[PDB]
Structure formats: C-alpha cells, structure tokens
Amino acid sequence: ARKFFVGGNFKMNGSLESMKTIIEGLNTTKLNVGDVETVIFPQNMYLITTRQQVKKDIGVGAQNVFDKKNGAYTGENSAQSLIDAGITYTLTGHSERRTIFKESDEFVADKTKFALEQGLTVVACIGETLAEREANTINVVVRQLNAIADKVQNWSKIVIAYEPVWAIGTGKTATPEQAQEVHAEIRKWATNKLGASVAEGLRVIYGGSVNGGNAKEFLKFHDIDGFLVGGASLKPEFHNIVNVHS
Amino acid sequence: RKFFVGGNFKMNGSLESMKTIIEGLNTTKLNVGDVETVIFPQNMYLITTRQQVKKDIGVGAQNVFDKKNGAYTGENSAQSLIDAGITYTLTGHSERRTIFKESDEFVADKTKFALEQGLTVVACIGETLAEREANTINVVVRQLNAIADKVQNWSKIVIAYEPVWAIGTGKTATPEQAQEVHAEIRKWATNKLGASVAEGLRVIYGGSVNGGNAKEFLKFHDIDGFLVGGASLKPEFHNIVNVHSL
Numbered sequence: 001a002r003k004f005f006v007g008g009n010f011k012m013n014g015s016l017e018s019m020k021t022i023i024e025g026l027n028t029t030k031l032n033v034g035d036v037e038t039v040i041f042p043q044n045m046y047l048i049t050t051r052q053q054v055k056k057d058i059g060v061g062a063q064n065v066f067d068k069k070n071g072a073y074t075g076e077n078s079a080q081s082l083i084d085a086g087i088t089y090t091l092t093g094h095s096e097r098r099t100i101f102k103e104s105d106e107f108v109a110d111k112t113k114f115a116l117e118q119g120l121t122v123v124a125c126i127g128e129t130l131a132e133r134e135a136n137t138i139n140v141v142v143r144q145l146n147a148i149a150d151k152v153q154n155w156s157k158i159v160i161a162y163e164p165v166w167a168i169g170t171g172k173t174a175t176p177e178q179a180q181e182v183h184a185e186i187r188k189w190a191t192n193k194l195g196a197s198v199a200e201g202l203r204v205i206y207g208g209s210v211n212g213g214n215a216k217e218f219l220k221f222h223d224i225d226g227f228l229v230g231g232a233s234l235k236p237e238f239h240n241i242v243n244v245h246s
Numbered sequence: 247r248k249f250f251v252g253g254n255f256k257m258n259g260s261l262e263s264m265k266t267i268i269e270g271l272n273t274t275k276l277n278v279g280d281v282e283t284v285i286f287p288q289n290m291y292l293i294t295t296r297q298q299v300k301k302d303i304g305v306g307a308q309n310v311f312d313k314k315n316g317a318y319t320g321e322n323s324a325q326s327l328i329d330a331g332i333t334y335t336l337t338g339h340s341e342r343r344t345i346f347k348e349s350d351e352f353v354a355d356k357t358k359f360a361l362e363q364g365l366t367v368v369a370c371i372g373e374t375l376a377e378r379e380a381n382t383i384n385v386v387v388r389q390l391n392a393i394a395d396k397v398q399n400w401s402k403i404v405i406a407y408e409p410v411w412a413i414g415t416g417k418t419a420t421p422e423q424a425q426e427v428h429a430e431i432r433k434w435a436t437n438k439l440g441a442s443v444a445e446g447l448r449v450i451y452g453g454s455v456n457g458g459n460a461k462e463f464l465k466f467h468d469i470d471g472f473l474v475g476g477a478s479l480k481p482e483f484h485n486i487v488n489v490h491s492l
Contacts, residue, residue, distance in 0.1 A: 011318060012311060012316055045290070071257055075342050076257045077257075082290065087290070
C-alpha cells in the first residue's frame with residue numbers, strides 16, 4: 001500500500017505576505033500525517049524561512065537542484081546546502097525546466113542521483129507534449145524514466161510525477177481516465193524494468209490540473225497515488241486536496 | 247562613479263558557514279560613502295542574508311528570470327526579490343552563459359525586466375581563453391550591444407568584466423590588461439550612450455580577485471570596483487571591501 005502523496009509546487013510566485021498566509025494556513029489544517037505525505041515546494045528564496053515556519057509534519061522541497069557538489073555554479077541550488085537547512089525534498093525535471101531551460105533526460109537523471117545520494121527525496125517529473133501524444137506517449141515517458149534508471153539504483157525515495165504537458169494551454173482538459181491510462185503504463189514500465197516490488201511501492205502522482213472537488217474522482221482510478229498540485233497549491237483549495245481522505 | 251565591491255558566493259554555503267561569513271561582514275568597519283558593497287548568496291539564503299547582514303550592505307540574487315510571477319518552476323522572481331528587500335541581481339554571469347547557454351539576448355531581457363521591477367543589475371560580460379587571442383573587444387561589445395538594444399536607462403546598471411579565463415583559474419588579469427578592456431568598454435558606452443552616461447557607468451573587474459592582488463588595481467582609473475568570487479567566502483573579503491577607503 002503506497003502512502004498518499006500531495007506536493008504543492010508554488011512555481012515562480014510569492015510575496016512575504018502571501019507566503020506567510022500560505023504557511024499559516026498549512027500550520028492550522030488538521031493533518032493526519034499517517035495517511036498523507038505533504039510537501040510544499042516554494043520559490044527558491046523562501047526555502048529556509050518556509051522550513052523554519054511550517055510545522056514539521058509538512059515537508060519542504062526545492063523546485064530544482066544542480067547535479068554537483070558545492071562550487072562555482074552561479075544561480076544554482078546545491079543539494080548539500082538544501083538538506084543542511086532541513087529541506088529534504090526536491091523536484092527534478094519539471095516540464096517547465098525541460099521545455100524553457102531544455103534540461104535533458106540525462107541532466108535530470110544526474111540531478112536525481114546526486115540529490116538522492118545527499119539524502120533528499122526526489123519528485124522526478126515526466127510527461128509528453130501534444131505533438132508526442134499523437135503516437136508516442138508511452139515511448140516518451142519510458143525514455144524519460146530510462147534515463148533516470150540508468151543512473152539510480154535505489155527508488156525508495158523517488159516519487160514520479162506525471163505531467164500531461166499536452167493538456168497545458170491547449171484547451172484540452174485531461175480527464176482522470178486519460179491520466180489512469182498513463183499511470184498504468186508507468187507502473188508497467190517500472191514492473192518490467194525494476195521488478196514488481198519496486199513498481200508496487202512506487203508513488204506515481206498526477207501533475208495535471210486538479211482541485212479538491214475532483215481530487216477524489218482522480219483517486220478512484222487504479223494507479224494514481226497522489227498529486228503534484230500547481231496553481232491550487234497557492235490557494236485555500238490546497239487544503240481540500242491534502243485532506244481529501246477526511 | 248562610486249567604487250563598487252560585490253561578493254559572489256556562487257553555489258556554496260551552509261547554515262553555520264553563512265552565519266559566520268555575514269557576522270564577519272557585520273563587524274567590519276565600512277566607509278559606505280566611499281564603497282557600495284553587495285553580497286550575492288546562494289538562492290536559498292537570500293532572505294536570511296538580508297535579515298542578518300547590516301543595512302549598509304546590499305543583498306543581490308545570483309540570477310533572475312525575465313518575466314512577472316508565473317509558471318517558471320525553479321526560477322527567481324524579480325518582483326519577489328524586491329518585495330523582500332533584495333535590491334540587486336547578477337545577470338549573465340559566465341557560468342550561466344556557458345553551463346546554461348544563456349544568450350546575449352536572454353541576458354539583456356533579464357536585465358531590462360529586473361531594472362523595470364526596481365533592481366540594480368550587475369550585468370556580467372567577458373571573453374574566453376580562445377576569444378582572448380584576437381577577439382576580446384568583439385565579444386564584450388557584442389554582449390553590451392545586446393543589453394543596449396533592450397535597456398534605455400543605465401543608471402542602475404553596473405558592468406562586470408570577468409575574463410572567463412580568469413574565473414576560478416587563479417590567473418588574474420593584470421590591471422594593465424583590465425584597464426584597457428575597461429577603457430574600451432567606456433569608449434563603447436560613450437559612443438552608444440553618450441559621454442554623460444559613460445562617465446557615470448561603473449565597470450568592475452572580476453576574476454581571481456583576492457586580498458593579495460586587490461590594491462594593484464586601484465591605480466587604474468577605469469576600474470570602478472571588483473566582483474569577487476571565491477575570496478568573498480573568506481575573511482580576506484574584509485580587506486577587499488575596505489581597501490578603497492584606506
């Protein structure tokens with residue numbers, strides 16, 4: 001039985017006031033920590049103050065990390081620095097970084113491997129564009145996942161986030177059935193590549209648009225283990241996703 | 247032109263080391279009328295650095311994106327920086343141009359947006375080892391022209407000339423070479439922006455500046471300060487920051 005996982009990706013948003021509000025909101029929500037692993041991923045500059053201010057039952061993660069030890073990489077987040085301040089999670093390979101900053105499959109894998117070695121849990125993001133959806137959905141996520149498998153032996157601290165990039169800004173709303181289809185394919189790939197015990201423990205979270213109302217409709221589908229929430233994670237709605245089981 | 251000293255911490259730090267580096271700067275006597283001093287910590291420390299370092303010292307990001315708050319996972323927001331009292335940023339550092347392939351045009355776009363949102367920008371330029379053969383001025387003028395194409399007002403720009411071959415290699419440019427590049431940069435600014443703007447423009451030297459070679463630069467009238475790398479994490483930074491005022 002895989003533990004329900006809800007990540008909140010704030011993206012490149014925030015003010016001092018809005019982050020105080022979000023954090024105080026999370027501190028007063030009734031969390032059953034036994035049945036949900038909750039993590040928020042604030043904009044880089046807020047990482048330490050978010051960890052200081054949000055209660056221990058909520059994880060804090062970076063939105064990106066570099067793949068090397070501390071050194072001369074101006075502008076980057078260090079995995080070593082992150083966990084030294086108590087930031088224990090990170091995203092790698094988010095679609096916005098694969099597209100805007102052309103992060104390669106191999107670069108995402110190397111960041112994942114290094115972050116894991118340094119003690120972080122990695123939410124490794126994958127997903128296909130609309131052109132790739134025409135015929136190559138399986139081939140794309142399989143290729144993205146294989147690059148990670150080439151570098152990473154231990155998947156106990158990986159969770160996979162499936163982003164339906166094809167449904168972003170295309171008028172197309174990705175339905176729960178369409179998500180279930182891909183999540184099943186991801187778990188099939190993991191069974192085939194890593195063995196059944198890894199695949200059955202591996203969280204595969206949906207990273208397309210979701211709210212507290214249809215959260216339950218998505219969780220009715222057989223292979224969806226939680227969510228990487230985008231825009232709703234800045235809003236009170238995030239609490240109804242985190243707390244969906246109660 | 248007020249002398250400018252920046253300290254680029256790059257992708258370094260721990261809670262313990264960052265607390266003592268800042269405490270070292272807090273208890274260092276400064277002539278703020280004489281030197282504009284700024285430190286650029288790793289992204290995660292931006293808020294705690296602004297909280298802990300005395301008001302006489304500015305804090306800046308090591309990089310910023312070129313758009314308003316939105317869906318750019320992993321990036322620093324210029325609006326968010328300003329909201330929290332971070333009033334500086336680097337753009338175009340050579341490590342970002344080389345590792346992350348930031349173009350002249352992207353750097354110019356970031357510079358313009360950061361300026362519009364209220365930041366002072368240390369726009370970084372410089373030529374490689376191969377370009378040093380015969381193409382030094384072709385390169386820095388091209389990089390500057392891209393900035394001028396997007397930016398009308400240079401009041402809150404500082405130019406940092408860091409020869410790539412001098413970054414982290416220990417091979418400091420001699421002041422005599424630095425002076426002539428800066429003289430060409432000021433010649434370019436005179437022609438492009440007018441003598442008045444050119445005469446107020448800070449052009450600072452970066453590249454293996456340390457407490458032992460700092461003084462030699464002060465005799466050259468087109469070198470308006472330093473962008474210090476590895477030495478900015480060391481107690482000798484306390485020299486470089488004050489050495490103009492001695």
